[PDB]
Design a protein around this ligand. Structure first.
Ligand code: PLP
Ligand code: PLP
Ligand code: MG
Ligand code: MG
Ligand code: MG
Ligand code: MG
Lengths: 318, 318
């Protein structure tokens, strides 16, 4: 019996993917089963509650972040529960579904209209966040790419739950990246108990997080157009890049073999573990996380016509 | 640690709605936090597993049901996990989102095209189900309106969990209806422990389940165009009808006061409990269920333009 929905954040299920990985012990943490629908419930709850506890955030404090995705939805839920104003800075590319969910939770949306000269809205949204911090008195910037509380939420969140459940040695921990909060915080907790666990980052082809050559990327959730301040690269032992097509095939294989309907970055994870398995020992124990549901990828991954277009994008292999 | 996603069906959270109901003890069972996204995980899992256990369903058995909604999605998930073929009979009114989710799980869809003479597809889908049962050898009809396993799943499911958690006397149990499996099965279990609990059905205005005058109804999930065989009316102590507008206001109030983003029939439940509270004792203990998420109601309940249209439909009150 809970007093709030907040009490059901965390303690997410762990499954073994027996059918998909018959020659390894692969455990998936179902972070998408958080009450808000994604893993971002963890940093949204943790960051806001920490700020309230330490007097940085009061009922009068206006929360700000540039996000069009899962973190915007999570922040909107937590802000509504706590009685806090929230403004999400977004751009015209936001999916109508996410926009409507964020607005349904009563958050404000500040949509930038001016692309930079070469078509992106990235620098425009960075600037808009600073404008709001200049003009809205009593504000708190979630600051997802630099806030230590992001990775700390994952250290105390799924990272702690993983090492309590998977007490046998963890040979590989595999996570997708955007802010790198998840892989930093979870790997830090895992390696306290399993110091020899290898930490494998999965990124989108074209993401600049690990210096890849930028290409047009369709899938949200995985990859970034900046190097996050949160990232400490010496803590990453292997980096696997996956393209949109590969990722989508991974999602479709996971639902076919296991009946788990997960989002794009989970497909990236599946593709990456299939690559990893060609080099590692049979029987290895691999832990990963499934951040969100397939539901908002119906016109991406789960669309056959989109899939065919992504197949055509594989450069020379197309 | 689970071997399958199926192990995470059930044991859903119970919250208290302190803010929405400050003068009563109102407990909500979050059935939408089942892994498939709605309460229909319970009958889908229970019915299929029972059939397999008793030799009515084997790997060669083709599952059939007429459903465009939550039960189709749940059946598709369970069928995929179990390795079973599924055909959902639907009509042109199916939402594109639900259609895409059911197809993503690998289920077959049989969409009827011929309305009857007065515009509905109800009799056409009833006939299509019998045609498939005539022409597909080795089939099993889920038969949601008449299958005893539907209400049994809820007796063993949330009903059992409710009486284990809420050991204090339950004064009112409030549930929405379509097949009446939920209210029948859950009330039967509740009244073993709390024989004086009053059982309150919440239906859509215009639904024929309790003999209301049919009107055009927008919201899916609640109400039916037949009297379910499953229903035993002597077990229902009070019936509250709610219209589309009322239900939508209930959803919007629940998310505003509690940060819970739930679907149409949850709004019906909220509207009905607000009515109930005008007659019952202050401080009463009320238990209810929240069957699904707000996510597929973004162009219904959570659309301001749709809400205004429903406001205009309230007959003389408009
Ligand atoms: C947040 C997110 C990630 C990446 O997590 P970070 O902690 O930001 O590195 C991957 N997939 C999805 C769907 C996400 O929401
Ligand atoms: C199934 C369903 C109901 C009604 O439940 P029954 O057991 O069929 O009476 C109400 N709301 C939603 C969203 C449902 O999926
Ligand atoms: Mg002010
Ligand atoms: Mg970026
Ligand atoms: Mg045959
Ligand atoms: Mg009907």
């Amino acid at each position: 019996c809970h007093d709030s929905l907040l009490d059901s954040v965390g303690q997410t299920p762990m499954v073994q993917l027996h059918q998909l990985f018959p020659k390894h012990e692969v455990f998936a943490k179902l972070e998408y089963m958080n009450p808000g629908g994604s893993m971002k419930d963890r940093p949204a709850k943790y960051i806001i509650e920490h700020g309230i506890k330490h007097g940085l955030i009061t009922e009068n404090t206006h929360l700000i972040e540039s996000t069009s995705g899962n973190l915007g939805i999570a922040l909107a839920m937590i802000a509504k529960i706590k009685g806090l104003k929230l403004t999400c800075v977004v751009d015209p590319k936001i999916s109508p579904t996410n926009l409507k969910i964020i607005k349904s939770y009563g958050a404000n949306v500040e949509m930038v209209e001016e692309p930079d000269a070469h078509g992106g809205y990235l620098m425009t949204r960075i600037a808009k966040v600073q404008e709001l911090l200049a003009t809205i008195d009593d504000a708190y910037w979630i600051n997802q790419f630099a806030n230590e509380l992001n990775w700390q939420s994952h250290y105390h969140g799924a990272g702690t739950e993983i090492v309590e459940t998977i007490k046998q040695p963890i040979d590989y921990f595999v996570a997708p990246v955007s802010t790198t909060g998840s892989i930093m915080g979870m790997s830090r907790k895992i390696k306290e108990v399993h110091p020899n666990a290898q930490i494998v980052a999965v990124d989108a082809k074209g993401s600049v997080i690990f210096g890849d050559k930028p290409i047009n990327r369709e899938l949200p959730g995985i990859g970034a157009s900046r190097v996050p301040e949160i990232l400490n690269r010496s803590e990453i032992n292997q980096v696997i890049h996956v393209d949109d097509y590969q990722s989508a095939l991974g999602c479709r294989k996971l639902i076919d073999y296991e009946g788990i309907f997960a989002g794009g970055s989970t497909g990236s994870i599946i593709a990456a573990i299939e690559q990893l398995i060609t080099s590692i020992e049979e029987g290895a124990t691999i832990v990963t996380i499934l951040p969100d549901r397939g539901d908002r990828y119906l016109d991406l991954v789960y669309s056959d016509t989109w899939l065919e277009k992504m197949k055509s994008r594989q450069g020379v292999k197309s």
